Write a protein that binds this ligand. Sequence first.
Ligand SMILES: CNC(=O)c1cc2ccc(F)cc2nc1C
Length: 165
Amino acid sequence: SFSGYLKLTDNVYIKNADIVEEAKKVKPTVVVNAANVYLKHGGGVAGALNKATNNAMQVESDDYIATNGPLKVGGSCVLSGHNLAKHCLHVVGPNVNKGEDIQLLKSAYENFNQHEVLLAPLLSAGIFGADPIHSLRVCVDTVRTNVYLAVFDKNLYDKLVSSFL
Ligand SMILES: CNC(=O)c1cc2ccc(F)cc2nc1C
């Protein structure tokens, strides 16, 4: 199972790890993708997860979008996890660089509650522009299921653990 995680609360754990490498080692039931409404996995966690699937995640996502249209900001969809997990929960956090509403971050984390255990990144963090300390706070105050957070950046990981209330 998951190893080397620091327990923050009854149900939230955190580790300084590359979510792609973490997904391949563990092969969780669910890996969370930091998706956009179009499921266009270009950069950040999305580009990295997609590149690990040899673009199979993007091909599957384009078929999903052609059939269903785009997701909502704060929404999600369950697709295959390919070589990384049983499933991939594509969650759309607000992108503050695209002027999207930060209040939608709680709605985005609510999607995690439909899954008993997940390997995930901090939503709206990184290239999405939100404050990662705020994202971790929303995560522990919203998610009730078991979440194993993978934080790529070592200096951000230290700042998050050392500042956690
Ligand atoms: C094998 N690793 C990767 O391909 C990789 C992983 C990342 C994970 C999170 C992130 F936000 C960025 C990452 N970037 C990359 C290139």
